[PDB]
Write an enzyme that holds these catalytic residues in place. Structure first.
Site, PDB file in Angstrom:
ATOM      1  N   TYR C 177       0.826  -1.195   0.000  1.00 48.57           N
ATOM      2  CA  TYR C 177       0.000   0.000   0.000  1.00 48.57           C
ATOM      3  C   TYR C 177       0.868   1.256   0.000  1.00 48.57           C
ATOM      4  O   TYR C 177       1.969   1.264   0.547  1.00 48.57           O
ATOM      5  CB  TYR C 177      -0.946   0.004   1.198  1.00 48.57           C
ATOM      6  CG  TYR C 177      -1.817   1.233   1.280  1.00 48.57           C
ATOM      7  CD1 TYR C 177      -2.573   1.643   0.191  1.00 48.57           C
ATOM      8  CD2 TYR C 177      -1.893   1.979   2.451  1.00 48.57           C
ATOM      9  CE1 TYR C 177      -3.373   2.765   0.258  1.00 48.57           C
ATOM     10  CE2 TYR C 177      -2.692   3.107   2.531  1.00 48.57           C
ATOM     11  CZ  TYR C 177      -3.432   3.494   1.430  1.00 48.57           C
ATOM     12  OH  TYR C 177      -4.235   4.613   1.492  1.00 48.57           O
ATOM     13  N   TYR C 187      -3.388   4.320   8.927  1.00 44.51           N
ATOM     14  CA  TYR C 187      -2.757   3.051   8.588  1.00 44.51           C
ATOM     15  C   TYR C 187      -1.548   2.884   9.498  1.00 44.51           C
ATOM     16  O   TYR C 187      -0.411   3.143   9.096  1.00 44.51           O
ATOM     17  CB  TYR C 187      -2.331   3.053   7.116  1.00 44.51           C
ATOM     18  CG  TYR C 187      -1.864   1.718   6.558  1.00 44.51           C
ATOM     19  CD1 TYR C 187      -2.777   0.757   6.133  1.00 44.51           C
ATOM     20  CD2 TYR C 187      -0.510   1.435   6.424  1.00 44.51           C
ATOM     21  CE1 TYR C 187      -2.350  -0.457   5.604  1.00 44.51           C
ATOM     22  CE2 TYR C 187      -0.077   0.230   5.898  1.00 44.51           C
ATOM     23  CZ  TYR C 187      -0.998  -0.710   5.491  1.00 44.51           C
ATOM     24  OH  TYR C 187      -0.558  -1.906   4.970  1.00 44.51           O
TER      25      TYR C 187
HETATM   26  N1  LIG Z   1      -7.481  -4.438   0.844  1.00 43.91           N
HETATM   27  C1  LIG Z   1      -6.782  -3.426   0.325  1.00 43.91           C
HETATM   28  O1  LIG Z   1      -7.420  -2.269  -0.168  1.00 43.91           O
HETATM   29  C2  LIG Z   1      -5.284  -3.512   0.261  1.00 43.91           C
HETATM   30  C3  LIG Z   1      -4.560  -2.448  -0.267  1.00 43.91           C
HETATM   31  C4  LIG Z   1      -3.206  -2.603  -0.537  1.00 43.91           C
HETATM   32  C5  LIG Z   1      -2.589  -3.819  -0.272  1.00 43.91           C
HETATM   33  N2  LIG Z   1      -3.306  -4.862   0.251  1.00 43.91           N
HETATM   34  C6  LIG Z   1      -2.610  -6.138   0.519  1.00 43.91           C
HETATM   35  O2  LIG Z   1      -3.255  -7.249  -0.074  1.00 43.91           O
HETATM   36  C7  LIG Z   1      -3.025  -8.413   0.694  1.00 43.91           C
HETATM   37  C8  LIG Z   1      -4.350  -9.119   0.939  1.00 43.91           C
HETATM   38  O3  LIG Z   1      -5.386  -8.354   0.362  1.00 43.91           O
HETATM   39  P1  LIG Z   1      -6.789  -8.149   1.128  1.00 43.91           P
HETATM   40  O4  LIG Z   1      -6.920  -6.735   1.545  1.00 43.91           O
HETATM   41  O5  LIG Z   1      -7.854  -8.796   0.334  1.00 43.91           O
HETATM   42  O6  LIG Z   1      -6.590  -9.037   2.443  1.00 43.91           O
HETATM   43  P2  LIG Z   1      -7.713 -10.115   2.817  1.00 43.91           P
HETATM   44  O7  LIG Z   1      -9.048  -9.504   2.662  1.00 43.91           O
HETATM   45  O8  LIG Z   1      -7.569 -11.336   1.994  1.00 43.91           O
HETATM   46  O9  LIG Z   1      -7.403 -10.394   4.366  1.00 43.91           O
HETATM   47  C9  LIG Z   1      -6.164 -10.972   4.687  1.00 43.91           C
HETATM   48  C10 LIG Z   1      -6.040 -12.194   3.797  1.00 43.91           C
HETATM   49  O10 LIG Z   1      -4.798 -12.819   4.026  1.00 43.91           O
HETATM   50  C11 LIG Z   1      -4.958 -13.995   4.793  1.00 43.91           C
HETATM   51  N3  LIG Z   1      -4.243 -13.825   6.067  1.00 43.91           N
HETATM   52  C12 LIG Z   1      -4.388 -12.808   6.974  1.00 43.91           C
HETATM   53  N4  LIG Z   1      -3.538 -13.033   8.002  1.00 43.91           N
HETATM   54  C13 LIG Z   1      -2.852 -14.175   7.760  1.00 43.91           C
HETATM   55  C14 LIG Z   1      -1.870 -14.857   8.473  1.00 43.91           C
HETATM   56  N5  LIG Z   1      -1.232 -14.239   9.464  1.00 43.91           N
HETATM   57  N6  LIG Z   1      -1.347 -16.030   7.959  1.00 43.91           N
HETATM   58  C15 LIG Z   1      -1.794 -16.517   6.746  1.00 43.91           C
HETATM   59  N7  LIG Z   1      -2.767 -15.831   6.045  1.00 43.91           N
HETATM   60  C16 LIG Z   1      -3.287 -14.681   6.544  1.00 43.91           C
HETATM   61  C17 LIG Z   1      -6.447 -14.218   5.028  1.00 43.91           C
HETATM   62  O11 LIG Z   1      -6.817 -15.525   4.652  1.00 43.91           O
HETATM   63  C18 LIG Z   1      -7.136 -13.181   4.164  1.00 43.91           C
HETATM   64  O12 LIG Z   1      -7.696 -13.747   2.999  1.00 43.91           O
HETATM   65  C19 LIG Z   1      -2.391  -7.964   2.000  1.00 43.91           C
HETATM   66  O13 LIG Z   1      -1.023  -8.301   2.013  1.00 43.91           O
HETATM   67  C20 LIG Z   1      -2.542  -6.457   2.001  1.00 43.91           C
HETATM   68  O14 LIG Z   1      -1.425  -5.841   2.597  1.00 43.91           O
HETATM   69  C21 LIG Z   1      -4.643  -4.721   0.518  1.00 43.91           C
HETATM   70  C1  LIG Z   2      -6.396   2.093   3.912  1.00 50.18           C
HETATM   71  C2  LIG Z   2      -6.509   0.998   2.871  1.00 50.18           C
HETATM   72  C3  LIG Z   2      -5.137   0.432   2.522  1.00 50.18           C
HETATM   73  C4  LIG Z   2      -5.066  -1.032   2.884  1.00 50.18           C
HETATM   74  C5  LIG Z   2      -6.235  -1.774   3.030  1.00 50.18           C
HETATM   75  C6  LIG Z   2      -6.163  -3.121   3.365  1.00 50.18           C
HETATM   76  C7  LIG Z   2      -4.923  -3.727   3.544  1.00 50.18           C
HETATM   77  O1  LIG Z   2      -4.850  -5.054   3.878  1.00 50.18           O
HETATM   78  C8  LIG Z   2      -4.623  -5.360   5.189  1.00 50.18           C
HETATM   79  C9  LIG Z   2      -4.544  -4.313   6.097  1.00 50.18           C
HETATM   80  C10 LIG Z   2      -4.315  -4.572   7.436  1.00 50.18           C
HETATM   81  C11 LIG Z   2      -4.164  -5.880   7.869  1.00 50.18           C
HETATM   82  C12 LIG Z   2      -3.951  -6.079   9.120  1.00 50.18           C
HETATM   83  N1  LIG Z   2      -3.730  -6.281  10.244  1.00 50.18           N
HETATM   84  C13 LIG Z   2      -4.242  -6.932   6.966  1.00 50.18           C
HETATM   85  C14 LIG Z   2      -4.473  -6.667   5.623  1.00 50.18           C
HETATM   86 CL1  LIG Z   2      -4.566  -8.042   4.480  1.00 50.18          CL
HETATM   87  C15 LIG Z   2      -3.759  -2.987   3.405  1.00 50.18           C
HETATM   88  O2  LIG Z   2      -2.548  -3.585   3.591  1.00 50.18           O
HETATM   89  C16 LIG Z   2      -3.829  -1.639   3.073  1.00 50.18           C
END
Ligand SMILES: NC(=O)c1ccc[n+]([C@@H]2O[C@H](COP(=O)([O-])OP(=O)(O)OC[C@H]3O[C@@H](n4cnc5c(N)ncnc54)[C@H](O)[C@@H]3O)[C@@H](O)[C@H]2O)c1
Ligand SMILES: CCCc1ccc(Oc2ccc(C#N)cc2Cl)c(O)c1
Ligand SMILES: NC(=O)c1ccc[n+]([C@@H]2O[C@H](COP(=O)([O-])OP(=O)(O)OC[C@H]3O[C@@H](n4cnc5c(N)ncnc54)[C@H](O)[C@@H]3O)[C@@H](O)[C@H]2O)c1
Ligand SMILES: NC(=O)c1ccc[n+]([C@@H]2O[C@H](COP(=O)([O-])OP(=O)(O)OC[C@H]3O[C@@H](n4cnc5c(N)ncnc54)[C@H](O)[C@@H]3O)[C@@H](O)[C@H]2O)c1
Ligand SMILES: NC(=O)c1ccc[n+]([C@@H]2O[C@H](COP(=O)([O-])OP(=O)(O)OC[C@H]3O[C@@H](n4cnc5c(N)ncnc54)[C@H](O)[C@@H]3O)[C@@H](O)[C@H]2O)c1
Ligand SMILES: CCCc1ccc(Oc2ccc(C#N)cc2Cl)c(O)c1
Ligand SMILES: CCCc1ccc(Oc2ccc(C#N)cc2Cl)c(O)c1
Ligand SMILES: CCCc1ccc(Oc2ccc(C#N)cc2Cl)c(O)c1
Lengths: 298, 298, 301, 301
Positions: C177, C187
């Site tokens: 992110y 965050y």
């Molecule tokens: N959601 C966003 O808008 C956002 C933005 C930028 C980056 N990301 C990144 O995308 C990745 C996942 O996307 P997301 O937002 O759909 O997450 P997500 O909705 O999938 O939630 C976390 C996911 O990772 C798995 N997970 C969480 N903790 C874990 C653990 N400790 N061990 C093994 N698996 C675990 C869960 O099964 C879950 O599906 C993350 O690395 C996050 O940093 C998300």
């Molecule tokens: C503000 C939106 C940006 C953003 C949204 C969701 C994200 O995904 C996670 C955020 C926090 C945690 C925790 N604990 C786990 C995951 Cl997979 C992220 O990395 C960054």
């Protein structure tokens, strides 16, 4: 995956089968898109001759047996916007003989009536009249010549094609690392311009995103022995060697690898991608040190 | 120019006359500031001995004939926040013998009652237990050890000194290029952490700017043969050579050049400067190519 | 044919539901015809497996052509651990952790080699920071190091153990992110730091993995997406305000559906990207590019 | 004594009044005791010289100790030109250009060598883009190239001609705006491009000048300041909204007085900075660092 069927694309900066220009046009066609070209007048006749002759036919082969087909090879001088901007020397220059409507504005119009609205814009063209001179030696004339040809050409291309680009269309331009870090030999103010090309890639991603809904991105790409590159054991022969020895990926850099990347930024898959500088360079951007330097042991 | 007279400063990470730590403390004193130190317990006794003996006296010379004076040399382990966090091995470790109040929280308190509120915070300390191993070999334990010691220590230092830092005070931490580009040999997850240190420099510039009105900056600095560096023809002997041959400035990199820079970021002159990564490295950050590579001719 | 992944096998670590970017990738890796395997955080494998078996996610499992995405294997996987011996009795006997074993990285990586053989593709879609609702000035060391142990290092260990079983030309991609490179308030808990470490270990590993194995490593810096994991951050969701901000301030004024990043990843993990390594790709509707929020209260409406 | 510039001579190109950053630097170069010379754009040398001679700017010329800043020479200087032969008869005879000659770069650089001898310090504080109120999609080529000819190249030519007469260890610094690296709407006419070229030519020249001459070259990316040149951009000033934005969104919530950048430059041009070259320094109250405007209309007040 990526069927751009029913989309029209315009590729500016293609006069041979060696430049990145070609590669892009080649991958675009292979995905189903209609593909046109803008070619530097002086070298147009020859390019066409090459094509007609059936000698670039090995290069035009689709991984299925079809030969690429172009919807139009348009004379294009990106140093010129509208006809009132072309000098009388040029108008009378023998090598521009019997061609007209080659200014950006003019070509844009020709494409619209000939092909309609388009979806994809590729910018593959640069010219440094003092490229071989260090900045401390580059004159104003060259600097500005280097900028006009290699940077503003993009903004003008967007300025005229934008109004005829469908929504969600995309545009791509090619930059070099020298824009961010000092690359000796990339003089003549080409580095300066490239940097402007990247900024403008961003600035336009904003103006074209909002006004036209059009994505705009850049590829900072690695050394490739195009004809434009060959013309500076040459400066780019040494360029290729360095990148081969010092990059994360010990592999050759083919025209295509940029075509591939280009395809993407120009396909729906990249609908969320804009203002980006994407390094297609075998990962050499990531190194902060020559590994083959004479300063470490071999 | 820069009279920091009537300002109190705390420098964490000084145990000898060779580290960047020293340099900073040295330039700060030379500007009129009161200067305290946080020193790693195990090596505290020796440091003091060095000082008392009158053998670091050549190093303590002010460009006028005065000898630097420190308002206090405080035992400090930045691996530890509050006393409840120090293991029973350590408490019983011979080298920590007869010292207490060395956790971050603890020192912060000691400084307040001893010196009052402060103005300047210098962060000059890092530890990678697996620094010599490539990332693909660095274990979790080391990675996290490398991060805790070298990165979070900063956030915790701010967390505890911030509440006792005057408005317009400033804080500085030292990073390495490996944080942005790949520098082979800077393994053990020190690169990872350094990158976190830079991000946190930014993130904190925001939290400390708003809550406390305190500026927070980093110096990404070039190779210097501190004792901490010597301990990895060594890895840093080769480091110095590379930077000497490939940087814009063909000159030696003295401890001070970072002290100078540090002085600035810690002086009023830099009242508008926060969240910055300032390259004090003879300009090597700007190069995008080794000039002495075995790939070009000599 | 421009993107054909038939014969290639992919492992997507971090998939528990059908809302996260993780899902979108497995779905995009698979329309390309790749055989796809999953790692699900142990405590919710039951709830996930059941949604699958039952059919609740059939609507989400439909590809373009109108067939259903299947998985080569659903692997229990806790990314906080590397080895059976790393597991504390606390968990060894956690009611939610019962009914499963061999769920450390080194173990998964083994079972995958036994079950599927060498892989070509690897996806790191996971993160975890217990104090993410906390500013850095209020973040604990323990919680900070955890964020990093879960979101950053996990990627390293994931490359270490899946590396040897990856084919030359293989690819891996993590997710990040914008908070890594510029302050995004709220965050917290060290996640911003953790993602920065991640992007840097993506430059480093790209070099190391790129040499030893000839594998490429890449990061997709994505915009905000309403996923289970996001909605858990912190009425009006903290994630919602972000999505809103973006919609009003990003060059491309449009919704960010997960598929976007889905397709973005597919590129990076495909032959097309065979000269792209060590990069951070902003799949954010161009928001990375802006120097000013355009709907500031300082500016005229 | 930490910053002592006695014996050193400085040339500050781009000073017509007492509101611009330019002024602030001459003032900061000089309290450090350096001997300072100025280049003033020809058309307003009369108005400037008269404000000086008269005393209108005495309030602005006071240093800390309570003495007045004096100048070693006020040089007519048009940065758009390099050589007498570059000058078009249009100007050769422009009513405002009359009463002066030898105002090209190569010429100034000569007269300075005649009058003062080798310099140690050089300041590029100038820029000019006729279509800056125009977006890039509405910017002409002629106007774009002009921006670049005035704000970027001028720096190059300024190094070329002042280079040979600079002492080893000398310094030069240009000025930039954040618009170079991220979109700042309203800052148009190609200036954003022009500043980007500038920051890059600052990395390049730092290398070249750094080798040939041993001189350092640096950029100070500054925040918004109400100067004559700014107030000319575009009721409520376009510059004012920027200043406002910053005050509400930058980490350090404070006014940006020119002296700030004044002192920032002084550092970069001093012995203290003798290992700093090729950098872009954000003197912006930390605004460069932020990923979000905090007073967005998308966010709660
Ligand atoms: N959601 C966003 O808008 C956002 C933005 C930028 C980056 N990301 C990144 O995308 C990745 C996942 O996307 P997301 O937002 O759909 O997450 P997500 O909705 O999938 O939630 C976390 C996911 O990772 C798995 N997970 C969480 N903790 C874990 C653990 N400790 N061990 C093994 N698996 C675990 C869960 O099964 C879950 O599906 C993350 O690395 C996050 O940093 C998300
Ligand atoms: C503000 C939106 C940006 C953003 C949204 C969701 C994200 O995904 C996670 C955020 C926090 C945690 C925790 N604990 C786990 C995951 Cl997979 C992220 O990395 C960054
Ligand atoms: N060759 C490489 O490795 C390399 C490396 C980095 C970047 N690039 C960039 O990629 C782009 C294409 O590079 P290439 O050298 O492979 O292609 P190329 O060799 O075909 O040269 C670019 C094309 O632009 C054309 N052109 C020049 N001036 C023009 C004008 N004013 N109007 C219209 N067309 C004009 C040239 O004739 C040429 O055909 C360039 O912008 C270059 O900056 C190339
Ligand atoms: N030596 C160089 O060229 C070089 C290059 C780049 C960056 N740096 C950075 O500059 C900083 C100082 O570098 P240096 O090596 O010159 O100084 P140094 O040699 O004195 O080492 C840093 C100091 O921190 C101390 N320290 C280690 N762990 C500690 C702990 N947990 N608690 C308290 N103190 C602890 C060490 O004992 C040492 O005195 C470091 O953060 C390093 O990352 C140094
Ligand atoms: N004002 C700001 O908030 C701001 C922000 C970032 C960077 N800068 C940079 O600072 C520099 C000057 O600062 P400023 O804003 O005080 O400008 P300014 O108020 O001084 O106005 C322009 C100055 O440069 C000189 N100048 C203008 N055009 C010239 C020409 N073509 N030839 C020779 N001299 C010329 C004028 O004498 C004038 O003093 C510029 O390069 C500008 O890009 C300004
Ligand atoms: C190591 C160099 C790699 C490299 C090769 C070719 C490039 O393209 C050009 C370069 C100069 C000129 C001109 N005139 C024209 C073009 Cl198309 C480039 O930008 C960078
Ligand atoms: C080329 C390397 C330059 C370099 C030299 C010294 C550095 O500082 C440390 C490095 C490792 C450890 C440990 N353990 C401790 C410290 Cl103070 C550094 O970060 C980078
Ligand atoms: C939005 C504030 C940022 C900003 C404000 C003022 C600046 O200075 C100039 C701006 C435009 C022109 C012209 N033509 C000339 C100068 Cl000296 C600048 O570079 C950037």
């Amino acid at each position: 995956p990526i069927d751009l069927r029913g989309q029209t694309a315009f590729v500016a900066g293609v006069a041979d089968s060696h430049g990145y220009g070609w590669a892009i046009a080649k991958h675009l066609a292979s995905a189903g898109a209609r593909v046109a070209l803008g070619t530097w007048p002086p070298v147009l006749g020859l390019f066409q001759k090459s094509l007609q002759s059936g000698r670039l036919d090995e290069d035009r082969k689709l991984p299925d047996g079809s030969l690429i087909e172009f919807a139009g090879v348009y004379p294009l001088d990106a140093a010129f916007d509208k006809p009132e901007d072309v000098p009388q020397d040029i108008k009378d220059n023998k090598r521009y003989a019997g061609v007209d409507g080659y200014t950006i504005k003019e070509v844009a119009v020709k494409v619209k009536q000939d092909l309609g609205n388009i979806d994809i814009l590729v910018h593959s063209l640069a010219n440094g009249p003092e490229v071989t001179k260090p900045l401390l030696e580059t004159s104003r004339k060259g600097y500005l010549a280097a900028s006009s040809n290699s940077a503003y050409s993009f903004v003008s291309l967007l300025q005229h094609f934008g109004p005829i680009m469908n929504e969600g269309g995309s545009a791509v331009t090619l930059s070099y690392l020298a824009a961010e870090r000092v690359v000796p030999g990339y003089g003549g103010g080409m580095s300066s311009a490239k940097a402007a090309l990247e900024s403008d890639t961003r600035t336009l991603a904003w103006e074209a995103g909002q006004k036209y809904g059009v994505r705009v991105n850049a590829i900072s790409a690695g050394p490739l022995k195009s004809r434009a590159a060959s013309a500076i054991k040459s400066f780019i022969d040494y360029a290729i060697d360095y990148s081969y020895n010092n990059a994360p990926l010990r592999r050759d850099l083919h025209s295509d690898d940029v075509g591939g990347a280009a395809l993407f930024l120009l396909s729906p898959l990249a609908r969320a991608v804009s203002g980006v500088t994407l390094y297609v360079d075998n990962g050499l951007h990531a190194m902060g040190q020559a590994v083959d330097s004479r300063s470490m042991p071999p």
